[PDB]
Design a protein around this ligand. Structure first.
Ligand SMILES: [Mg+2]
Ligand SMILES: [Mg+2]
Lengths: 104, 184, 227, 144, 143, 68, 313
RNA sequence: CCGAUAACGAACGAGACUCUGGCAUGCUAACUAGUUACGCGACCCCCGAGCGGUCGGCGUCCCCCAACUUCUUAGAGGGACAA
């Protein structure tokens, strides 16, 4: 064996990330896994603000760009020989995954 | 019962003028412990009519630019001024403040561009004008002087409430009335 | 584990990889109707999908060109050997793609003809390919020595609000002609209908649709049907 | 007697400052961050902090045990959050555990004196825009 | 009763504790305590002969109600606003030597020690005699 | 002050009234639910703006013969 | 010779009161499920201007509360609301014990079984579910239910012949049996949507109302039809007298009371209109509940008041 | 926008829209956020009061040696429409 592992899911898209978390969690719960639910880490907003003009002429307008990162944590309590295949069938190309042991 | 600052019981003051007792808020329902609240009194017209008078005085006292958010300073300034006033005359400080506001608000004014006609003053503009004149008089009296701001405010209020032609406020009121009379 | 990068820097680097890959692949196979790219990153062998119009020459002779393209990608971006593979897909409804139509306009202009005739032909092809509306702008040293701009709008086109983020698509090209460059700007408003692939789902926010009622007959004298 | 689990936890807010009041069943003890109400921050606004106990009297507070922790905000904002939390916590404790008419009378005697004793003030702060030092103000403009 | 440090006014608590701490002459005071300038963002070394005892008092109080503090924590605690000429003002930290010296002198009284992590914290002796001083000052104020 | 409804709301409400008059009443919330379930309105604000105008129009109809 | 006279009002909650529930075991408390997301227990202290005082308010519902009932022992209360969930309350400080994570859309009516064992809910997502008393649903009924919103759902009060009825905006009075939850009759004959149904204390006849204005009686044993009697405008509530005849109905801003041996109107009960400006139509009546002795009736109006009506002479 | 009407039917811009602020003791949850409760450990008072007071002291998910989500986080929904 009984191994505690943790799955970290990060994406820039909220809805697809929650789809991946939901399908992984329900696939775990149907397989007799004790799972601690998706813990949403506070979102990170990267906030480059720039001058909007190639030259220096004009009324001093600014662009305000931002990119948001969302994180979730899922905990599993069985060996990796089922969780590797249950996460390989949930890809959804915007999500980047680390799987790690509680011992890590 | 409420007895602002823990002394100076409120339900003995009298506002003689009808026109200004509609717009002065020292009575029993506007009777509060401190002249400080997050009122949201500026959201509509005439909501400053129901703001209590002591808090309007503290609001106008927090002004010359180096004092803009410093409200606790003005609260203790007003507290000290009220103790000085009651110690000087023995009258309720609320009553003498009310009398000063009565006696310092002008009742006729003149305005145009092409000061041509003399007009009348609404009985909310004269409350604002009286408070502004009193605070300005206290501020100018205390500027380069050994006297602190509290007893300058105190002597401004007592001289205005007696009526002496010796306050800044009643001098300004009389001069405004005179100029308004000149072109009535 | 041994080498680590913070998540902010990691996502910014992923975006920079996508931008540089898209620009290089635009610059390389522009004469093949490139029209965008997709990357599928995974903690194993990754995939890059090229959404060309003509895939039979994106793939070279027996796929030589796709092989040298995955070779240069693996040699530039420092992928380990075999961890990157490169695919090609033919795009459906090339008349609804702004990049392909802007390249077609560039091809016609470089071949040489009236700018009017080329823009009219591109515009009417875009319309009969299924667009809700189109807008083609050509700007530069046209007939004459002073620069003009000419737009060839037709149909329906939105400009403001959030729906113009996903519901039209634009493309800007430069045409290196004999006397300076001309600028090509093509905007295509996409249809909504199938909620599938040819356009987007979630229709325009001020378009309500009301379902029609049924017949609703026999309100007459009471009857009861038992089982 | 010693009926347990008689407790509520009610918050109050002023612009960032959140004070959460824990109202147990005890005998007349009220404390903020472990220190009493009379040993609190700047004490110019001490009446502003203990005006609920002056309005309701000590008989309403004689059977409760308030314990308030407060985070965020400034000095004054924390004062207002504290007093709003205490009043709202007493109202919640009365409504959950004693009769509803008592809640109604404490609630309305709080409403005819400074409504922010029970309702939060929603005005937070405005963002700075890129043409001047603040939300509304603009940088000085030069003509010649 | 009662009472503790928390439920008495901290101003005359620091005054009373500094008086107690000066009265029992075991606090080690360095030799340069009259030329210090105390945190370079200010001038004019304090208008007191006995500023060291009051600083040790307030350090002991701060370590009582928030433990694990080090020299960086104390130089953040006693920091202030540096008026900076014609340039605008900024925040500057306290003097590191005076914080280290008051901490070491208080360790010499066996009322603070380095805990298992970094920083320092009160002994049972330290919180004992601070609560006794708190009782003394509370009884003085109420009566 | 500044609560004029645009022609999107007005003509959507008119078609809703014309087609589904029997299931609507002078209650904003039930009209809101009906308009939610008989029309694909993409946003909540537009949905209950349309429902508010439907309520107003049914008070007008219950008075007399407006169009209708 | 019998008239109804109002002995005061029950003030104390600001919203549309939508349901009144009374209990037979302790006739000093009633429930008021209103539109301010609360349920109120009242102390029925028969006084002047103080006929009822609110005694405890039950919160925990996210949106408007639609229905409420009382258990046979008068210890538990069950209520559904417009947040799409049910909630089982109790007396003794009124904390919810169980909550029923149910329909996708919002519920409209709940009903205790005869033995307080089965829980049923009719909802706006066009489904009906029967529930276990601990929270779990047994199974929903679908694809032969109403094709519109399932309005009020009632159980037969007798354990013999367990019968559950279901009106709806489908203009059908679909009746299900508790043995296997299959359809047994398919009553047609209404012209508009149906607001409520009620079953008589004997499980023989039921009455349905709606936008027709016809309080349209039915039969349960032979189950073919009975007489139809039409009162006024929109019908909001229907309930039979508990010990006696005189079925009543809430029709607009007045409640009409009818006997059954003979179909005459017995009385008309209106609020006395003051300051008639001819601008605002009078406040409708939204709920009716007898006090389990046939002596007083509580009528819930669409302003924030509920009226008690007392029999006279 | 209502209406009037040699115009009728439309298209863009406005509005809708997107992000943000303010409300949910209702939902989904959390040893990378906590809160109550409990058990230890320090001090204060006591004559003993004590289920007393303070603690950002320790522990209570290596599995029961506790529950819960008010406070924190962020998802789904609700909520305001001149009703
Ligand atoms: Mg806009
Ligand atoms: Mg500023």
């Amino acid at each position: 064996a009984i191994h505690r592992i943790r799955i970290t899911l990060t994406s820039r898209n909220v809805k697809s990330l929650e789809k991946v978390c939901a399908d992984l969690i329900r696939g775990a719960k149907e397989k007799n896994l004790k799972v601690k639910g998706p813990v949403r880490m506070p979102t990170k907003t990267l906030r480059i603000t720039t001058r909007k003009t190639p030259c220096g002429e004009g009324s001093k307008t600014w662009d305000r760009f931002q990119m948001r990162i969302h994180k979730r944590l899922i905990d599993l309590h069985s060996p990796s020989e089922i969780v590797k295949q249950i996460t390989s069938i949930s890809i959804e190309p915007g999500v980047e995954v680390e799987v790690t042991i509680a011992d890590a | 019962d409420i007895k602002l600052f823990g002394k100076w019981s409120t339900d003995d003051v009298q506002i003689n003028d009808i026109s200004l007792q509609d717009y002065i808020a020292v009575k029993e329902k506007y009777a509060k412990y401190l002249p400080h609240s997050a009122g949201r009194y500026a959201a509509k017209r005439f909501r400053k009519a129901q703001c209590p008078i002591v808090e309007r005085l503290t609001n106008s006292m927090m002004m010359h630019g180096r004092n803009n958010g410093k409200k606790l300073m003005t609260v203790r300034i007003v507290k000290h001024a009220f103790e000085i006033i009651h110690l000087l005359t023995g009258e309720n400080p609320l009553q003498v403040l009310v009398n000063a506001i009565i006696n310092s608000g002008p009742r006729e004014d003149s305005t145009r561009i092409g000061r041509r006609q003399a007009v009348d003053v609404s009985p909310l503009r004269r409350v604002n004008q009286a408070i502004w004149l009193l605070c300005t008089g206290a501020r100018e009296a205390a500027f380069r002087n050994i006297k602190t701001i509290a007893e300058c405010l105190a002597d401004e209020l007592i001289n205005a409430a007696k009526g002496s032609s010796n306050s800044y406020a009643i001098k300004k009121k009389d001069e405004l009335e005179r100029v308004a009379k000149s072109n009535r | 584990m041994a080498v680590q990068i913070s998540k902010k820097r990691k996502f910014v680097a992923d975006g920079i990889f996508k931008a540089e890959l898209n620009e290089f692949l635009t610059r390389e196979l522009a004469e093949d109707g490139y029209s965008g790219v997709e990357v599928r990153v995974t903690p194993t062998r990754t995939e890059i999908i090229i959404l060309a119009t003509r895939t039979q020459n994106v793939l070279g002779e027996k796929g030589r060109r796709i092989r040298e393209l995955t070779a240069v990608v693996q040699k530039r971006f420092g992928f380990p050997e075999g961890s990157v593979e490169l695919y090609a897909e033919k795009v459906a409804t090339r008349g609804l793609c702004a990049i392909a139509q802007a390249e077609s306009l560039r091809y016609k202009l470089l071949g040489g003809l009236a700018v009017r005739r080329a823009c009219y032909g591109v515009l009417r092809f875009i319309m009969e390919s299924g667009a809700k509306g189109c807008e083609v702008v050509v700007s530069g040293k046209l007939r004459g020595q002073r620069a003009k701009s000419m737009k060839f709008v037709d149909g329906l086109m939105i400009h403001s609000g959030d729906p113009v983020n996903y519901y039209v698509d634009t493309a800007v090209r430069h045409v290196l002609l004999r006397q300076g460059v001309l600028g090509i700007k093509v905007k295509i408003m996409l249809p909504w209908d199938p909620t599938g692939k040819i356009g987007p789902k979630k229709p325009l926010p001020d378009h309500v649709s009301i379902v029609e009622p049924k017949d609703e007959i026999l309100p007459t004298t009471p009857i009861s049907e038992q089982k | 007697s010693k009926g347990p689990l008689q407790s509520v936890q009610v918050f109050g807010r002023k612009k960032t400052a959140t004070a959460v009041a824990h109202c147990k069943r005890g005998n007349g003890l009220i404390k903020v961050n472990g220190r009493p109400l009379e040993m609190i921050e700047p004490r110019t606004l001490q009446y502003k902090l203990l005006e609920p106990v002056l309005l309701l009297g000590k008989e309403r507070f004689a059977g409760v045990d308030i314990r308030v922790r407060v985070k965020g905000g400034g000095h004054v904002a924390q004062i207002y959050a504290i007093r709003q939390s205490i009043s709202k916590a007493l109202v919640a404790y009365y409504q959950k555990y004693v009769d509803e008419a008592s809640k109604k009378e404490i609630k309305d005697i709080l409403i005819q004196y400074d409504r922010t004793l029970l309702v939060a003030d929603p005005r937070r702060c405005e963002s700075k825009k890129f043409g001047g030092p603040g939300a509304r103000a603009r940088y000085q403009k030069s003509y010649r | 009763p009662g009472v503790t440090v928390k439920d008495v006014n901290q101003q005359e608590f620091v005054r009373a504790l500094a008086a107690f701490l000066k009265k029992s002459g075991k606090l080690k005071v360095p030799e340069w305590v009259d030329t210090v300038k105390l945190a370079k963002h200010k001038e004019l070394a304090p208008y007191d002969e006995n500023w060291f005892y009051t600083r040790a008092a307030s350090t002991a109080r701060h370590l009582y109600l928030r433990g694990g503090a080090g020299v960086g924590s104390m130089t953040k605690i006693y920091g202030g606003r540096q008026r900076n000429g014609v340039m605008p003002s900024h925040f500057s930290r306290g003097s590191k030597s005076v914080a280290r010296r008051v901490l070491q002198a208080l360790e010499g009284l066996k009322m603070v020690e380095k805990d298992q992590d970094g920083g320092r914290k009160l002994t049972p002796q330290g919180q004992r005699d601070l609560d006794r001083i708190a009782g003394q000052v509370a009884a003085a104020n109420k009566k | 002050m500044g609560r004029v409804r645009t022609k999107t709301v007005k003509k959507a409400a008119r078609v809703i009234i014309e087609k589904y008059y029997t299931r609507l009443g002078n209650d904003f919330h039930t009209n809101k639910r009906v308009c939610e379930e008989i029309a694909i309105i993409p946003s909540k604000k537009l949905r209950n703006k349309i429902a508010g105008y439907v309520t107003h129009l049914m008070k007008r109809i219950q008075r007399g013969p407006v169009r209708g | 010779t019998e008239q109804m006279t109002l002995r005061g009002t029950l003030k104390g909650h600001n919203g549309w009161v939508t349901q009144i529930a009374t209990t037979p075991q302790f006739p000093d408390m009633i429930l008021s499920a209103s539109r301010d997301k609360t349920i109120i227990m009242w102390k029925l202290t028969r006084d002047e201007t103080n006929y009822g005082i609110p005694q405890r308010a039950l919160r925990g519902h996210s949106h408007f509360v639609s229905d409420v009932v009382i258990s046979s022992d008068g210890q538990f209360a069950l209520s559904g609301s417009w947040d799409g969930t049910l909630r089982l309350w109790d007396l003794t400080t009124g904390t919810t014990t169980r909550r029923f994570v149910g329909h996708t859309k919002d519920v409209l009516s709940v009903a205790f079984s005869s033995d307080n064992r089965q829980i049923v809910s009719g909802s706006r997502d066009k489904t009906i579910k029967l529930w276990n008393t601990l929270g779990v649903c047994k199974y929903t009924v679908q694809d032969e239910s109403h094709s519109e919103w399932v309005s009020c759902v009632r159980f037969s009060p007798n354990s013999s012949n367990p019968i559950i009825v279901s009106c709806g905006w489908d203009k059908l009075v679909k009746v299900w049996n508790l043995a296997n939850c299959k359809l047994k009759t398919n009553h047609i004959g209404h012209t508009g949507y149906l607001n409520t149904v009620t079953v008589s204390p004997d499980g023989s006849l039921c009455a349905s109302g709606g936008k027709d204005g016809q309080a349209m009686l039915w039969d349960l044993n032979e189950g073919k039809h009975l007489y139809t009697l039409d009162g006024g405008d929109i019908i909001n509530a229907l309930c039979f007298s508990p010990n006696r005849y005189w079925l009543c109905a809430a029709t607009g801003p007045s409640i009409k009371i009818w006997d059954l041996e003979g179909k005459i109107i017995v009385d008309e009960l209106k609020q006395e209109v003051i300051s008639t400006s001819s601008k605002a139509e009078p406040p409708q009546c939204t709920s009716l509940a007898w006090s389990a002795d046939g002596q007083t009736l509580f009528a819930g109006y669409t302003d924030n008041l509920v009226r008690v009506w007392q029999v006279t002479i």
